């Protein structure tokens, strides 16, 4: 099949700038006079919406903001001057031949000022370990950029099996993330180890931020 | 003022069959090309197959499920069948016609979601997140529901009725051993709690089940 | 004249970004 | 007193020849459409539909001349006239449908299905064509002359207003369908061209019937084998009398310089735009209806012979702007280089046309009545060799180097076209 290769797979620019979002075929699209590339937009909750086709055709309604051009291989689209509402996903697909197939998606994130996390972590329930599980929650709130490395340890071990890491969306206001980290055990074990940590490495400092507790503490 | 919409049930058991309609108006399904697509749990966006303005169909080939697309001109209706389903056959899944003075997918149904699984539906366990029992305290104080343990989607979770909209944070749905759980954070002021309560209330419609939660300060 | 022009009026086809007329050949 | 003119065989001939002129300019632009759309960036199609068309002609015209000779004038004018009309028809039904289909036959068939509608679609437009050429022989090379007595100045103004009917449909008519084609669609253009000449068939075949009724003379007639009636017919063309003025009139077809050629790309090359084209564009027809009226003038004054001297020294005094052109700043072999060309071009439109209506003049004044057809179709065949040769050398080099080399190639051909009718005119006095 033809494979297309979308690059950046994402994006932070700032109002106002340019945004340019490739894409790359594993073969030519383009018959006779034509280009069988085609630009669509996705927001979150709503089903795609179609930006540019024949890979340089403006569609109804799309402020000329967007534009694309390419051919052969090499297709692009761009967005000049960028503004709040472009924060999406955007998807190359060709027409060539079938089977039609999709690029991976290029998400568009309005770039903000780097910011720290706030982080809390918050030990089981006395009313989940009556019921013979625990849980440890540990959240990262407000923080840029996305990425974020979240270690953790349990009496100064490292632990990777257990943990489901969600992110939020980003926030429409500050344009923060925020997630959550969840380690779950069992009450025995549980019982049998004294200190759990949640360690958050971002880029915002040298040294990641350290939050913990010890079971006997109270 | 063409419009394309998609129908379904909500959930398919491993094995069975599923059927999903396209119903579309402002425009004849005998002029153009009618494709289904679908987009997994992530971003990634899958071409299906189609039925032409003739009847005829394709499929793509690279599907490991099985499906047949059928019609009903005298209903402007299109179907889909998908054939013993599995657990990767969830995703959401769009209808879209393709013109032939266009050649691309110019209109598009809103789309809807169907998950595969072997699964009783279950009533949720809600529990209060407090602060590690320590004293120290900043400006402000974090406390937290967890709601775990449910099935299918979707739950609505507030904070005390919906009288505490700053501040709040809830976290995406994760699957866990056949059920969900997610959990939610809400940030106040020092002076706010615990002289003012705060509570979670949990609703999950599918189980007519509605929980209040209290978030007790940690006492030894 | 040529008996068989190939001229047509069209956008892009002769040179970039200018409509007009077009001869191929 | 126009109710009296209005039914005269000459203005029924004016007003068959002004539907037909229609007709066969928005086919051609309906072919050029469907060949850049369908079958761009592609070079070896282009060149088999000008090959075949132009060899088509190359090894007929003795045939189809031979064939006007020998029947009955009102018999073959209609059957010429249906046979292109229904085959234009038929391939504008075809065009409708590949335009409707165009991205199924680009993506989603076998590449046999978009080769066998091109060859469809050339078999077509080859036969629309030979019945074109047919056409043009029987009534501008026959009909016109019986229409005119003996009388010379009636014969010269028919000429020069079937002249000026050309030039006029060969800026409006593309205006129209390009119109048409994007206020519409290119399938509403085809099938308005597919209605256009099914009512028009009817028209003019009422038409001829009519002038035909109205010029008793014109059914006075004066009187392998295919292999033979070839040969036959191009010995007799090489010892006509007139063959060295036939000659150079087919040599001027092997030019570059007009706007039906590719000019129009090197003008947008060189920074002008499509507006400054159109308004150089009415400029040429404008010259060429100067050009007509100075062959009248001038056959009244000079006379025949000396009108094609006088014409073919303004042609070649016109060609030096564009020859001087090509050494000038700003050529790429400023706008001091495209400024000359474009007013040599234009300029040079005048003699241009002069000496075609002298050429052929002198063709239907002085070749016998029995040979009137059979001569015409080998100068047919002479015209187009002259026009296939241009249309391999405009493929072969497309880039603007090239360009000044096809002018100075352009100018040396109608120099030696010129000079073969002097020989004929020092001959012939
Ligand atoms: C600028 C257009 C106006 C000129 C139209 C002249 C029509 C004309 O010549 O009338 C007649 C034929 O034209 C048509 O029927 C075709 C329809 C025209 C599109 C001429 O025939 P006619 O009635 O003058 O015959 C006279 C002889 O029969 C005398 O016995
Ligand atoms: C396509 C529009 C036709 C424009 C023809 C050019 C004008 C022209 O040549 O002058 C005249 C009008 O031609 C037409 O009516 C053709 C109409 C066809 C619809 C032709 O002159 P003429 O030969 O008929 O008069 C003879 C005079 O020269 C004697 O004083
Ligand atoms: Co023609
Ligand atoms: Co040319």
């Known amino acids: 099949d033809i494979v297309l290769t979308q690059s950046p797979a994402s994006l932070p620019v700032s109002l106002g700038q340019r945004a340019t979002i490739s894409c790359r075929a594993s073969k030519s699209v383009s018959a006779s006079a034509y280009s069988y590339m085609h630009w669509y937009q996705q927001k979150p909750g709503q089903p795609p919406k179609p930006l540019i086709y024949l890979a340089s055709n403006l569609e109804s309604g799309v402020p000329a903001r967007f534009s694309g051009s390419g051919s052969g291989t090499d297709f692009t689209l761009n967005i000049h001057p960028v503004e709040e509402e472009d924060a999406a996903t955007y998807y190359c697909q060709h027409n060539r031949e079938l089977p039609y197939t999709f690029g991976g998606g290029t998400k568009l994130e309005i770039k903000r000022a780097d910011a720290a996390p706030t982080v809390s972590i918050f030990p089981p329930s006395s009313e989940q370990l009556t019921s013979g599980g625990a849980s440890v929650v540990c959240f990262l709130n407000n923080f840029y950029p996305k990425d974020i490395n979240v270690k953790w340890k349990i009496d100064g071990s490292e632990r990777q099996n257990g943990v489901l890491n969600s992110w939020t969306d980003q926030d429409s206001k500050d344009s923060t993330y925020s997630m959550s980290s969840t380690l779950t055990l069992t009450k025995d074990e549980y019982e049998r180890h004294n200190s759990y940590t949640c360690e958050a490495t971002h880029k915002t400092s040298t040294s990641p931020i350290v939050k913990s507790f010890n079971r006997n503490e109270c | ?220 | ?25 | ?429």
């Open chain 3, 1 to 25: 004249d040529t008996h068989f022009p190939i001229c047509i009026f069209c956008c892009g086809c002769c040179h970039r970004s200018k409509c007009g007329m077009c001869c191929k050949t």
């Open chain 2, 1 to 220: 003022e063409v419009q394309l919409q998609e129908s379904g049930p909500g959930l398919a058991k491993p094995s069975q069959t599923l059927s999903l309609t396209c119903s579309v108006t402002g425009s004849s399904i005998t002029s153009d090309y009618w494709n289904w697509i679908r987009k997994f749990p992530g971003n990634k966006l899958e071409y299906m197959g189609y039925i032409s303005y003739s009847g005829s169909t394709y499929y793509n080939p690279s599907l490991k499920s099985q499906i047949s697309i059928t019609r009903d001109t005298s209903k402007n209706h299109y179907y889909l069948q998908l054939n013993s389903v599995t657990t990767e056959d969830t995703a959401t899944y769009y209808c879209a016609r393709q013109g032939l003075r266009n050649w691309y997918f110019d209109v598009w149904g809103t789309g809807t979601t169907v998950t595969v699984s072997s699964a009783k539906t279950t009533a949720p366990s809600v529990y209060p997140l407090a602060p590690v029992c320590g004293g120290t305290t900043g400006s402000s104080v974090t406390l937290g529901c967890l709601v775990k343990g449910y099935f299918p989607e979707p739950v609505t979770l507030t904070w005390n009725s919906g009288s505490l909209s700053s501040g709040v944070h809830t976290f995406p749905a994760l699957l866990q051993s056949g059920l969900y759980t997610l959990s939610s954070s809400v940030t106040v002021t020092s002076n706010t709690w615990p002289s003012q309560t705060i509570t979670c209330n949990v609703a999950h419609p599918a189980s007519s089940t509605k929980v209040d939660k209290k978030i007790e300060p940690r006492v030894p």
């Open chain 4, 1 to 429: 007193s126009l109710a009296d003119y209005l039914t005269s065989a000459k203005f029924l001939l004016y007003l068959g020849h002004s539907l037909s002129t229609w007709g066969d300019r928005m086919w051609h632009f309906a072919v050029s459409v469907f060949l850049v759309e369908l079958y761009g960036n592609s070079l070896l199609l282009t060149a088999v539909y000008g090959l075949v068309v132009a060899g088509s002609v190359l090894v007929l015209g003795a045939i189809i001349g031979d064939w006007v000779d020998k029947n009955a004038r009102l018999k073959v004018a209609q059957t010429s006239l249906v046979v292109q009309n229904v085959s234009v028809i038929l391939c504008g039904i075809i065009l409708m449908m590949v335009f409707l289909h165009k991205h199924e036959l680009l993506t989603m068939y076998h590449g046999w299905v978009l080769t066998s509608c091109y060859i469809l679609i050339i078999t077509i437009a080859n036969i629309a064509n030979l019945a074109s050429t047919a056409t043009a022989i029987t009534i501008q090379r026959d009909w016109i002359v019986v229409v005119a007595g003996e009388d010379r100045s009636k014969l010269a103004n028919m000429n020069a207003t079937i002249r000026r009917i050309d030039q006029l449909t060969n800026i409006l008519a593309p205006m129209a369908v390009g119109q048409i084609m994007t206020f519409g669609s290119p399938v509403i253009g085809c099938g308005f061209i597919s209605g256009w000449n099914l009512v028009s068939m009817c028209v003019e075949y009422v038409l001829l019937w009519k002038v035909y009724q109205k010029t008793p003379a014109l059914a006075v007639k004066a009187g392998a084998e295919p292999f033979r009636t070839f040969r036959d017919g191009w010995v007799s063309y090489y010892n006509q009398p007139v063959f060295l003025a036939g000659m150079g009139l087919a040599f001027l077809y092997m030019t570059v310089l007009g706007f039906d050629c590719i000019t129009t790309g090197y003008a947008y090359t060189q920074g002008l735009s499509g507006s400054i084209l159109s308004i150089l564009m009415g400029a040429s027809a404008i010259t060429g209806i100067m050009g007509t009226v100075a062959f009248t003038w001038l056959r009244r004054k000079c006379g025949l012979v000396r009108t094609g001297l006088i014409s073919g020294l303004a042609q070649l005094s016109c060609l030096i702007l564009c020859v001087i052109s090509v050494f000038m700043p700003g050529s790429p072999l400023p706008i001091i280089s495209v400024s000359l060309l474009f007013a040599g071009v234009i300029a040079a439109r005048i003699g241009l046309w002069s000496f075609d209506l002298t050429v052929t003049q002198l063709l239907q004044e002085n070749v016998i009545e029995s040979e009137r057809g059979i001569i015409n179709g080998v100068q047919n065949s002479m015209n187009y060799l002259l026009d296939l040769l241009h249309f391999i050398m405009v493929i072969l080099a497309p880039n603007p180097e090239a360009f000044g080399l096809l002018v100075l190639i352009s100018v040396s051909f109608v120099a030696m076209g010129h000079i073969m009718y002097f020989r004929f005119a020092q001959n012939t006095l």
